[PDB]
Design an enzyme around this catalytic site. Sequence first.
Site, short mmCIF file in Angstrom:
data_model
loop_
_atom_site.label_atom_id
_atom_site.label_comp_id
_atom_site.label_asym_id
_atom_site.label_seq_id
_atom_site.Cartn_x
_atom_site.Cartn_y
_atom_site.Cartn_z
CB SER A 110 -0.65 0.94 -2.49
OG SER A 110 -0.77 -0.17 -1.74
CG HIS A 163 -5.15 -0.63 -4.03
ND1 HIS A 163 -5.67 -0.78 -2.87
CD2 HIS A 163 -4.12 0.14 -3.75
CE1 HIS A 163 -4.83 -0.17 -1.75
NE2 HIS A 163 -3.91 0.34 -2.49
#
EC number: 3.4.21.105
Length: 179
Positions: A110, A163
Amino acid sequence: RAGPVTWVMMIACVVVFIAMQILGDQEVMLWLAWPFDPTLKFEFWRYFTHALMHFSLMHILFNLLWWWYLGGAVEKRLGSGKLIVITLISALLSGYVQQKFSGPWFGGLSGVVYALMGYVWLRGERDPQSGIYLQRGLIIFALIWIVAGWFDLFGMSMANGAHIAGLAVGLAMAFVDSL
Ligand SMILES: *C(=O)c1cc(N)ccc1[C@@H](*)C(=O)OCCc1ccccc1
Ligand SMILES: CCCCCCCCCO[C@@H]1O[C@H](CO)[C@@H](O)[C@H](O)[C@H]1O
Ligand SMILES: [Cl-]
């Protein structure tokens, strides 16, 4: 055709995902997760191999689709070494941030995907003549993907810090490269 790094990362992710179904998630984590005990500190692969473990069909599917497309374009237009370094740095930093706030039990591409999004977009924007850019439609779908993650949509419960770390790395490197 997808290049050697784009390809080998996809293979490795599928092999590990298969291994996770057969042996169980927890057992695969014991070998590939970020060091969860001081004794594991010098096992250097673990700072990276957390990126190869996935827990959901949907994240592996979409992580690999983005990887295949953005990684593949980086590899073809800017070389394999470039993709390698982007992957290694983003995996390391996103991993570092993740473990700091949520402990060592995590995985997935991710973070690396955020970095390729950042990289490809900012590089197209600042340096058109490089050949790579993020197409208009894909900016949109990238943003929806980002938003789905940020606001915990579709029954997802991921950490935002890691992230952010991944995106920062991709932007940083795009910034460096367009000078
Ligand atoms: C990381 O794995 C991640 C990060 C963000 N921001 C969103 C999703 C994911 C994993 C992933 O791709 O999950 C699937 C999301 C999805 C895609 C299409 C339709 C419904 C849900
Ligand atoms: C909280 C108190 C008890 C701590 C227990 C932690 C034990 C450390 C586990 O080490 C790991 O064991 C796995 C199988 O057991 C191996 O796959 C792996 O190679 C090895 O690195
Ligand atoms: Cl996952």
